[PDB]
UniProtKB/Swiss-Prot annotation, chain A:
This is T-complex protein 1 subunit epsilon. It comes from Homo sapiens. Keywords: Acetylation, ATP-binding, Chaperone, Cytoplasm, Cytoskeleton, Disease variant, Hydrolase, Isopeptide bond, Neuropathy, Nucleotide-binding, Phosphoprotein, Ubl conjugation. Component of the chaperonin-containing T-complex (TRiC), a hexadecamer composed of two identical back-to-back stacked rings enclosing a protein folding chamber. Each ring is made up of eight different subunits: TCP1/CCT1, CCT2, CCT3, CCT4, CCT5, CCT6A/CCT6, CCT7, CCT8. Interacts with PACRG. Interacts with DNAAF4. Interacts with DLEC1. Interacts with SPMAP2. InterPro entries: Chap_CCT_epsi, Chaperone_TCP-1, Chaperonin_TCP-1_CS, Cpn60/GroEL/TCP-1, GroEL-like_apical_dom_sf, GROEL-like_equatorial_sf, TCP-1-like_intermed_sf, TCP-1_chaperonin. The lineage of its organism: Eukaryota, Metazoa, Chordata, Craniata, Vertebrata. Component of the chaperonin-containing T-complex (TRiC), a molecular chaperone complex that assists the folding of actin, tubulin and other proteins upon ATP hydrolysis. The TRiC complex mediates the folding of WRAP53/TCAB1, thereby regulating telomere maintenance. As part of the TRiC complex may play a role in the assembly of BBSome, a complex involved in ciliogenesis regulating transports vesicles to the cilia.
Swiss-Prot record, chain B:
It is found in: Cytoplasm; Melanosome; Cytoplasm, Cytoskeleton, Microtubule organizing center, Centrosome; Cytoplasm, Cytoskeleton, Cilium basal body. Disulfide bonds: none annotated. The modification N6-acetyllysine is found at K3. Component of the chaperonin-containing T-complex (TRiC), a hexadecamer composed of two identical back-to-back stacked rings enclosing a protein folding chamber. Each ring is made up of eight different subunits: TCP1/CCT1, CCT2, CCT3, CCT4, CCT5, CCT6A/CCT6, CCT7, CCT8. Interacts with PACRG. Interacts with DNAAF4. Interacts with DLEC1. The chain holds residues 19 to 49 of 539 of the full protein. The gene is CCT4. This is T-complex protein 1 subunit delta. It is linked to De novo genetic variants in nearly every subunit of the TRiC complex, including CCT4, have been found in individuals with a broad spectrum of brain malformations, and clinical phenotypes ranging from mild to severe epilepsy, developmental delay, intellectual disability, ataxia, and other features of cerebral malfunction. Belongs to the TCP-1 chaperonin family. The modification Phosphoserine is found at S18. It comes from Homo sapiens (Human). The modification Omega-N-methylarginine is found at R1.
UniProtKB/Swiss-Prot annotation, chain C:
Belongs to the TCP-1 chaperonin family. ADP binds at G35. Component of the chaperonin-containing T-complex (TRiC), a hexadecamer composed of two identical back-to-back stacked rings enclosing a protein folding chamber. Each ring is made up of eight different subunits: TCP1/CCT1, CCT2, CCT3, CCT4, CCT5, CCT6A/CCT6, CCT7, CCT8. Interacts with PACRG. Interacts with GBA1. Interacts with DLEC1. This is T-complex protein 1 subunit alpha.
Swiss-Prot record, chains D, E:
GO terms for biological process: binding of sperm to zona pellucida; chaperone mediated protein folding independent of cofactor; chaperone-mediated protein complex assembly; chaperone-mediated protein folding; positive regulation of protein localization to Cajal body; positive regulation of telomerase RNA localization to Cajal body; positive regulation of telomere maintenance via telomerase; protein folding. There is a cross-link at K242 (Glycyl lysine isopeptide (Lys-Gly) (interchain with G-Cter in SUMO2)). Component of the chaperonin-containing T-complex (TRiC), a molecular chaperone complex that assists the folding of actin, tubulin and other proteins upon ATP hydrolysis. The TRiC complex mediates the folding of WRAP53/TCAB1, thereby regulating telomere maintenance. As part of the TRiC complex may play a role in the assembly of BBSome, a complex involved in ciliogenesis regulating transports vesicles to the cilia. It comes from Homo sapiens (Human). Keywords: Acetylation, ATP-binding, Chaperone, Cytoplasm, Hydrolase, Isopeptide bond, Nucleotide-binding, Phosphoprotein, Ubl conjugation. This is T-complex protein 1 subunit beta. SUPFAM superfamilies: GroEL apical domain-like, GroEL equatorial domain-like, GroEL-intermediate domain like. It is found in: Cytoplasm. Belongs to the TCP-1 chaperonin family. ADP binds at G38, G92, T93, T94, S95, S162, S163, G404, E489, K494. The modification Phosphothreonine is found at T255. The modification Phosphoserine is found at S54, S254. The lineage of its organism: Eukaryota, Metazoa, Chordata, Craniata, Vertebrata.
Length: 535, 31, 49, 523, 523
């Protein structure tokens, strides 16, 4: 016993031992699986085309309604060391692939749920974890057997648009089912590097402004910034822009070190007044000598500069931020010039129509660039009738952009709708009996867990999972296994080849691998030492 | 026939009178 | 119902009577120091002066 | 979820109260502003418990809702909807709130009938498309022959104003709003029409100023009235020039050099004013403060000096006097001067203002708004803002529709006629959509005290066979022709009410679980 | 009301929340028991706060509602209604509860239409009369031809039991209900059919005892079994008779007289027993306890004696043995005896009971109820009580109606056809009455999980064109003929459901103001 020895003396091993808790047995394992059931019961409700949305209320009272599992799981207040890992699983899938924010939780939960019977059968906890590896290899090897694509990323982008439709079909933007699918394809293919199959995430910017409707979302071949012309009477239209990107304030140059100019005589006082006036004139003429007709400055302007900008018909905007002048210079093919005296025509940017847009009663004055020359950056401008649909639209297009990037990285695809998952479950079952040495129960449990996806999809689609699963699994065996899946409205037949339900091969390969590894690291634990109350 | 009737059972039935009573309490203050 | 001012309202004979008593309370002091036959007052403050 | 909770201070509700409390909160918003729908609605008193209680009387639905402080995480969805409507068009903010609430009321019944929430949404998407066509195909265009468009502007102005404080003052404020917008002769900036609020007189004693009013009375040593003045405005520095060299000191061996530099300072101030005066001006208005030194130098020239009238005052003055900001004065031949007839001061409500009368290129105006109480002035100002916003957009997009419930009935019939061509699984939801559209003229009649039970039937019968201009005549309590009565509404305001009401409602209906984070700083 | 309050510690609600909270609190009662309506409903468990919580599992709405503890002063109105239904007929307690709730739900919707509450009540009175005629004209009579009458009792018993725990045991408990009543051939006392609850065996193992069982095993020194016994029952004193003189003492000169009187005390007790034994009896049952002295005298005589079988046990024995209470024995020739074949004891559930088998004029019986758990025994007992209560009345009033929603659609049809002949001011209220009547077959289908959208439409369409026997087929999920299927209900049960819901519902509609007295004993 603690705090009491056989001699009547206190027995103290660790600090504040009376406030600790330890329970090993099989109870640590059942507690971990049981806690995972609470997590799986959450995400299963947002799987499939009928997936229901969640309302998340932040600690500060802010509210956003989302479908994206990355936004649901990241806003949890769960104080359980294993349930927190279930969130990290969805994070790893989101970072590597960006699709299966719901799938990896449902699959990993099924592996933990099906494992429950295996412990009750007396199978060593570690033998269960190893048995899942023997079955997982079978599903992965067969997953790569059925795959084909005709996407070349040149002009035949039909299956690429279809992939974007499959992804977006699960989101709340189906009113733009086609429009946003086309925007996503055009956004990536105009910046992607076909040589290395790399897409730089910084070359696609996503902006938005509250108002209008989702159907007004456009892809702009150029940049959008907050425009604020320093002179209020400056013309707001440039037809042919020769753009000077400058990172120096329009004021007399000053040293960076301590200066403290000594002025003694009146000739010194008055002479400085003249010299400073000349500096204001030179810094503006040095721009005009290059042929520039629009200046974009990181810094502000002096009052003296604004008048000279007017008289020299030289429009300019003020206080444009770091990343804004970086993107403008790249998009326009120019370079950032340190000083006024280093200005030259060779560093000017080239662009077409420059205009600012006024929105209703507000003063947002957003930039639009109409024409550009071989730009490698695009901007998406999202509209919407409320703040929530716009923020969700940002995530909806994000997923669409990510699966396009994934096809560029690897152009091998599989058939969705549960066809891949059911086929894998059947393949594992066929090999589960070759050979039933010790692992027969574990390999079958893996095959059953794989079905959690078409079953949850059937429930959310309004179908009985027994009536649906028994028919599809029979049809995939009686005949040469077709890409037969499930759907809610059936769309005629459930032939995934005709419904065009397209998913990425490398996506599912990661979902199986990451879910399996996460299950292993939380099964092989039999002792939790969490502290209790402070005192 | 009465040509219809308008049933009005809501807070204004009491508010419109309370507003006047408060004004009277001040209006008589300088009587 | 009543005046909605968060203080107290007193009118008529209530304040008219109090005004006279307040004046009398002060007069009751100085009346004792009138003429060459009056006597001195002693005033002591809180700190002992 | 409720069993074996692993949350620290958080909670969540699913499938039982998550949707119930979402519907309760959404209807609670609707019932609040319901009383403001239509021309006979009642006004609200909004007050806080103290700490500048900021007593406000208001009618507009958006102004009401933005000052309540809704706590319910689901009700906030409709609050944001009404905000956007206020920012985009500035009218119909009650109508879009009421419509969305009535749509959701029916949805609660549809869910109770065990209709899948995605089937309900699908039905409304089809009904919405039907309504979109009803509004587009019924639009009335206006192009040339301006004498006909101006008549439409009078109807649009009256229609918006009828719902606000400015009820029985139409003979003044309806023409006020239309004329102020017509004088813009350009983009609907909504900055060129300034409103000044003064106590004294009645609402009908206001007027539209054809010139421009300034604060900051005419100087000390300067004339109070100049005829046929040339106006120059400024955005420059008058004193404490501290010319552009940061870190400069006077380092001398004697006091004489200090006085000599001080003499140089006043020589520069003299030169500065002389460079300005070479323009040939009668007025000088500078955004920045004007010190006693140039005040005397300008006074000697007979030039009026106005200081710090406003930050943006130089922008409004330039547009209404025909000049330029002129932040620097060193090329008098490159600077345009403005023009007016009189710069005399006027007494408005026992307050002296500087009046620029007879200005050239006067692309702006000022409304001098008078009333008995601050509450009258504030609500009357908002009424002007609402009418000017609708008119400023009407002159941009001349498409209008018929009001008085006419547009709502046309939409309701379009949904009904097509709903009868769809299978019962979804038609039941399309009928609910149309019912919510019909609830709007029902509520409008109910707020006035009209027997809506029969008037709605009269509209349903009237619109069954033609009569595409029939609507609810709120003057007599009957059904009349909207074209003859002159009850019309803009296309753009009506389009946004239809579109945003459905979009917001869908967001609410899709939620089955509300997960609530633990609060902070609450103990 | 809230302004210028002149109440001590009381409060009141008027015209705003008085009706709102009354409708919410009362309608909620229907939703509570709504799930128990129909043959496929689920059962409830009711739990106490502690102190021998005495968990109860039950289905019947009356046993649910009477144990909730409703605090809302308006909801209590419907609770008392369900009590009366239970006391009068003992069935349909769920149907009347949910019907009244649906009527009240419609009333709230009608108030929202600005219909005066007295107009709504007037409309329901006319609709109620229409429904009453539908029941009168559709009743099915049964007279002679006993081979058809007995079938009716089997149908009524089956219908009631199908809604309780005794679902798939109908082939045993249907006969226990119908035959137990038919054997009484007399007044519906509802105490002549006793139920003994024992653990052990299944529900299907219950059986009917042809005789009568007694507690309090056969004595100490008395025969255990006599064939062809004559039975005498009694309600007299065995000892401490203290014959009728109050305040009498024995006051003697010596203890010798006390001993002599003590002998006299026993001599009179001996004579008393001899006066009873002269009757020529084999079995003696006395309500009052038997003391050591008469027990020896009865044993020596070869006659058994039972003490205090029950308070009313002697009265029940009189009815099943054909005798008389016989509280005094002074004319043996005027005292009637009973007769039976066996008085042997039997072992039932590890408990020895005295079995009077083959008893002449045995107008009583006992049902031996077996089950696995106490909750099974208690709910199964209630199921027997409910079926016997209805059957005891069906044998007195043979009028029945067709069930399965048939009667409800017939009532709704009559209300609808007549409502369409009345002006709209009242027709809107009569239609709401019919809508509530149709909610009952909707709830029944909805609890089972059937597509009520089609069953209600098909049933109404059937009854629109004859088919006055059409109803719900709860086995297949379709519409069937109630006469062929054999689904009938007692006329009196259906009449009271109609009348009670209408009468109770008016109580809520008439109230616009609730005044709540200050509470006592709350600190």
């Amino acid at each position: 016993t603690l705090a009491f020895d056989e001699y009547g003396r206190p027995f103290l091993i660790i600090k504040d031992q009376d406030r600790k808790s330890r329970l090993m047995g099989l109870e640590a394992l059942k507690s971990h699986i049981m806690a995972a059931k609470a997590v799986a019961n959450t995400m299963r409700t947002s799987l499939g085309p009928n997936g229901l949305d969640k309302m998340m209320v932040d600690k500060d009272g802010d509210v956003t309604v989302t479908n994206d599992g990355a936004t649901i799981l990241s806003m949890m207040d769960v104080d359980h060391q294993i349930a927190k890992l279930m969130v990290e699983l969805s994070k790893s899938q989101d970072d590597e692939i960006g699709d299966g924010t719901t799938g990896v939780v449902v699959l990993a939960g099924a592996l933990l749920e099906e494992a429950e019977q295996l412990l009750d059968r007396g199978i060593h906890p570690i033998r269960i974890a190893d048995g899942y590896e023997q079955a997982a290899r079978v599903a992965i090897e067969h997953l790569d057997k059925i795959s084909d694509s005709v996407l070349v990323d040149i002009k035949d982008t039909e299956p690429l648009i279809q992939t974007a439709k499959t992804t977006l079909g699960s989101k709340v933007v189906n009113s733009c089912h086609r429009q946003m699918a086309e925007i996503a394809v055009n956004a990536v293919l105009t910046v992607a590097d076909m040589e290395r199959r790399d897409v730089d995430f910084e070359l696609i910017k996503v902006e938005g402004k509250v108002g209008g409707r989702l159907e007004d979302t456009k892809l702009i071949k150029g940049v959008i910034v907050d425009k604020d012309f320093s002179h209020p009477q400056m013309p707001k239209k440039v037809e042919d822009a020769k753009i000077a990107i400058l990172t120096c304030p329009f004021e007399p140059p000053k040293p960076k070190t301590k200066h403290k100019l000594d002025v003694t005589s009146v000739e010194d006082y008055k002479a400085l007044q003249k010299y400073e006036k000349e500096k204001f004139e030179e810094m503006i003429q040095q721009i005009k000598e290059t042929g520039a007709n629009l200046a974009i400055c990181q810094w502000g302007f002096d009052d003296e500069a604004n008048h000279l900008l007017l008289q020299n018909n030289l429009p300019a905007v003020r206080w444009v931020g770091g990343p804004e002048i970086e993107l403008i210079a790249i998009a326009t093919g120019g370079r950032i010039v340190p000083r006024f005296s280093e200005l030259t025509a060779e560093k000017l940017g080239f662009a077409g129509l420059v205009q600012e847009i006024s929105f209703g009663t507000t003063k947002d004055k957003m930039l639009v660039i109409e024409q550009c020359k071989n730009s490698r950056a695009v901007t998406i401008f999202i509209r919407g009738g409320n703040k929530m649909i716009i923020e969700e639209a940002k995530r909806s297009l994000h997923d669409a952009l990510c699966v396009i990037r994934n096809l560029i990285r690897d152009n091998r695809v599989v058939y969705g709708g549960g066809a891949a998952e059911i086929s894998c479950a059947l393949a594992v079952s066929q090999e589960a009996d070759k050979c039933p040495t010790l692992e027969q129960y574990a390999m079958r449990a893996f095959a059953d867990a794989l079905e959690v996806i078409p079953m949850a999809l059937s429930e959310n689609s309004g179908m009985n999972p027994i009536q649906t699963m028994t028919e599809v699994r029979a049809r995939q065996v009686k005949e040469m296994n077709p890409a037969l899946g499930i759907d809610c409205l059936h769309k005629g037949t459930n032939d995934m080849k005709q419904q065009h339900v397209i998913e990425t091969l490398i996506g599912k390969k990661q979902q199986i691998s990451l879910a399996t590894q996460m299950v292993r690291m939380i099964l092989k634990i039999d002792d939790i030492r969490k502290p209790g109350e402070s005192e | 026939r009465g040509k219809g009737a308008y049933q009005d059972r809501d807070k204004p039935a009491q508010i419109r009178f309370s507003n006047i009573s408060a004004a009277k309490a001040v209006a008589d203050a300088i009587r | 119902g009543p005046l909605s001012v968060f203080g107290d309202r007193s009118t008529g004979e209530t304040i008219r009577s109090q005004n006279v008593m307040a004046a009398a309370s002060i007069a009751n002091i100085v009346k004792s120091s009138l003429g060459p036959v009056g006597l001195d007052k002693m005033l002591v403050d809180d700190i002992g002066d | 979820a409720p069993v074996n909770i692993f949350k620290a201070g958080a909670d969540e509700e699913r499938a039982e109260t998550a949707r119930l409390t979402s519907f309760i909160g959404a209807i609670a918003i609707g019932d609040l502003v319901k009383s403001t729908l239509g021309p006979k609605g009642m006004d609200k008193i909004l007050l806080s418990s103290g700490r500048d209680a900021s007593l406000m009387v208001t009618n507009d639905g958006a102004t009401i809702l933005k000052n309540i402080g809704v706590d319910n995480p689901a009700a906030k969805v409709l609050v944001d909807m009404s905000r956007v409507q206020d920012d985009e068009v500035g009218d119909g903010t009650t109508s879009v709130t009421v419509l969305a609430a009535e749509l959701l009321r029916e949805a609660e019944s549809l869910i109770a009938k065990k209709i899948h929430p995605q089937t309900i949404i699908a039905g409304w998407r089809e009904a919405t498309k039907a309504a979109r066509e009803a509004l587009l195909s019924s639009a009335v265009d206006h192009g040339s022959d301006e004498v006909k468009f101006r008549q439409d502007l009078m109807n649009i102005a009256g229609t918006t104003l009828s719902s606000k404080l400015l009820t029985h003052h139409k003979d003044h404020f309806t023409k006020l709003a239309v004329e102020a917008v017509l004088r813009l002769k350009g983009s609907g900036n909504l900055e060129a029409i300034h409103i000044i609020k003064k106590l004294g007189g009645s609402l009908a004693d206001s007027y539209l100023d054809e010139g421009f009013l300034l604060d900051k009375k005419i100087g000390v040593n300067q004339p109070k009235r100049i005829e046929n003045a040339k106006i120059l405005i400024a955005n420059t520095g008058m004193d404490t020039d501290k010319i552009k060299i940061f870190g400069s000191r006077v380092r001398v061996d004697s006091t004489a050099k200090v006085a000599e530099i001080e003499h140089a300072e006043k020589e520069k101030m003299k030169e500065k004013v002389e460079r300005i005066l070479k323009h040939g001006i009668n007025c000088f208005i500078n955004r920045q403060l004007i010190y006693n030194y140039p005040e005397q130098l300008f006074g000697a020239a007979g030039v009026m000096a106005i200081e710090h009238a406003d930050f943006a005052g130089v922008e409004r003055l330039a547009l209404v006097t025909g000049g330029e900001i002129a932040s620097t004065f060193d090329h008098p031949e490159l600077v345009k001067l403005g023009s007016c007839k009189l710069i005399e001061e006027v007494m408005i409500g026992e307050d002296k203002l500087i009046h620029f009368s007879g200005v050239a290129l006067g692309e702006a105006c000022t409304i001098v708004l008078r009333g008995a109480t601050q509450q009258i002035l504030d609500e009357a100002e908002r009424s002007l803002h609402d009418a000017l916003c609708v008119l400023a957009q009407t002159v941009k997009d001349s498409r209008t529709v018929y009001g008085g419930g006419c547009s709502e009935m046309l939409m309701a019939h379009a949904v009904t006629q097509l709903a009868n061509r769809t299978p019962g699984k979804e038609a039941v939801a399309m009928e609910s959509y149309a019912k919510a559209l019909r609830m709007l003229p029902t509520i409008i009649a109910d707020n006035a005290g009209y027997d809506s039970a029969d008037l709605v039937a009269q509209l349903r019968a009237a619109h069954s066979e033609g009569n595409t201009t029939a609507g609810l005549d709120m003057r007599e309590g009957t059904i009349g022709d909207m074209a003859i009565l002159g009850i019309t509404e803009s296309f753009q305001v009506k389009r946004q009410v239809l579109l945003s009401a459905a979009e917001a409602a869908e967001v609410i209906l899709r939620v089955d679980n509300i997960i609530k984070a633990a609060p902070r700083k609450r103990v």
